[PDB]
Write a protein that binds this ligand. Structure first.
Ligand SMILES: *[C@@H](O)[C@H](C[C@@H]1CCNC1=O)NC(=O)[C@H](CC(C)C)NC(=O)O[C@H]1CC[C@H](CCC)CC1
Ligand SMILES: *[C@@H](O)[C@H](C[C@@H]1CCNC1=O)NC(=O)[C@H](CC(C)C)NC(=O)O[C@H]1CC[C@H](CCC)CC1
Lengths: 299, 299
């Protein structure tokens, strides 16, 4: 049982390079539109307190250099939507996959295709944390890299990368340019607030551990939803709801372990730690696998 | 800092479905050859003790059904090379990337494109362990999935998946069909022997931790190569050689931390554990990042 990303080929064919002045970052080319972070128009001496409307007024279509491999694309229109720029180009991407834009919920996962200069470097799996940050791996030049899910043949884009927070975690927008969380695109230290653990995902992962033979943490206790949550609150775990219980139903069925029994085991793990033991090769409780992720990987 | 796989698009275009009888698994289609595990010719009542030469003699070209999406490929020749079958087909793969076959060394990493029925399901990063197993995520139907590295435009294929061992780890071949390690393709419980920790990779990861602000494990001690190795041997760590020291040179330079100083810190971690603390979000010492991986991800 592994942290697995979606195959990235459909997205690789959409990445381009966008340059305004000496600033370069990544854009996403779908149909005849290229989407990228609006701070591509900033110089280094703009990023502390940018007035994006005023900065963009000085820019014309020909100030945006868009490159797909050896080919320069011709920009024929531009507009700003929230924190993203949309550059209309004279060529529809022949590699455009079936796609949609979605705004994902906290607790859900997605794959990131980290890119530099329009070129894919690697792919990994992330969760949108309750506090609307992600724990990525991003360097200068990585903005405009995107997060996505694949649903059959269809790519659902849910994230575009914009910035780092003081804790080393990351923040960005949906593909309409609206940040996840309270963040703004300027070069200041910003607060994400308490991060809470995604309880339903921890339980999914404990189920995955059982499926994979690792079963030492199970016990002879059970609990109630209200009583577990008294312990969840204590550890900054999200409260568990009945909807979560029913989402875990299939995993509970495949293992024959009642959800509230697994909850009792989680309580003991939370209160007693792992006593140097491990679960699926980890000495920490993992919360970046959804139930759907766990079902996907054990089928 | 994240476990990151290579972008998988160039490999996605090479995966096909291979069916012999009711057995189906994955094949790799490059030029006019499809490569797949030879046990595609086995029935369930063959896999305990297969005589592959005798089984293959009963098979003709038209007994191999090869499907790339909606398209059936026509098999015009077949031969067995070690534990792989080579099916010559009447169509060269138009998506064949620049590629080569390499036999990778223990301690090196590669990306796995896990596939079922010829269709990519997900991508993750693995290491070839010292004992020539890998810790993958593979289900029935996953054989013929491949591991690879990408070097510029060129895909280096290094692994094809064949089996599970009793410890839940995995074993397979290079693309010439030669197993890594002592394993054979038959459905028996087989021994991998003691797994040792890839010391140079643990040090690379400790350097990555320093680069990423996490520095509590550093100390005021140093050591010698011989004296550390006395402690490496104890914990089933690979001995550190001067070649490893020089491989770590660049990371040592970027951090200004002498390799033998980092070794002294590792010794303390090995002898004292992590006292409930964490390193790059892990409560265990990670050994599946090479120095090159760490350089790649911090650039
Ligand atoms: C992409 O352009 C880039 C991505 C980050 C660079 C370092 N890692 C990243 O994730 N974004 C920025 O540089 C961004 C530009 C803004 C105008 C949107 N600025 C940014 O992330 O500034 C951060 C740097 C770290 C700092 C930490 C304080 C302790 C907070 C501001
Ligand atoms: C692909 O065909 C498949 C992959 C494995 C299935 C389960 N997980 C895998 O990695 N290979 C096999 O089924 C393989 C066929 C052989 C003829 C090569 N057999 C196999 O892996 O048998 C294993 C199953 C587990 C068992 C554990 C003993 C405690 C040892 C034999």
């Amino acid at each position: 049982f592994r942290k697995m990303a979606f195959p990235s080929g459909k997205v690789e064919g959409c990445m381009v390079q966008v340059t305004c002045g000496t600033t370069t970052l990544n854009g996403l080319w779908l149909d005849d539109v290229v989407y990228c972070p609006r701070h591509v128009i900033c110089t280094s001496e703009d990023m502390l307190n940018p007035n994006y409307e005023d900065l963009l007024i000085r820019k014309s279509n020909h100030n945006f250099l868009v490159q797909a491999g050896n080919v320069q694309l011709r920009v024929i229109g531009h507009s700003m939507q929230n924190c993203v720029l949309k550059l209309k180009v004279d060529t529809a991407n022949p590699k455009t996959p079936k796609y949609k834009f979605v705004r994902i919920q906290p607790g859900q996962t997605f794959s990131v295709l980290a890119c530099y200069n329009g070129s894919p470097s690697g792919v990994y799996q992330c969760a949108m944390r309750p506090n609307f940050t992600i724990k990525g791996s991003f360097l200068n030049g990585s903005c405009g890299s995107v997060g996505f899910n694949i649903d059959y043949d269809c790519v659902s884009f849910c994230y575009m990368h914009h910035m780092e927070l003081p804790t080393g975690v990351h923040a960005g927008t949906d593909l309409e340019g609206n940040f996840y969380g309270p963040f703004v695109d300027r070069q200041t230290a910003q607060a994400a607030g308490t991060d809470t653990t995604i309880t339903v995902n921890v339980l999914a992962w404990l189920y995955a551990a059982v499926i994979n033979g690792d079963r030492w943490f199970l016990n002879r206790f059970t609990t109630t939803l209200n009583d577990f949550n008294l312990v969840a609150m204590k550890y900054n775990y999200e409260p568990l709801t009945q909807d979560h219980v029913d989402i875990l139903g299939p995993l509970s069925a495949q293992t024959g372990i009642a959800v509230l029994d697994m909850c009792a085991s989680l309580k003991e793990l939370l209160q007693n730690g792992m006593n140097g033991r491990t679960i699926l090769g980890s000495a920490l409780l993992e919360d970046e696998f959804t139930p759907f992720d766990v079902v996907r990987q054990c089928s």
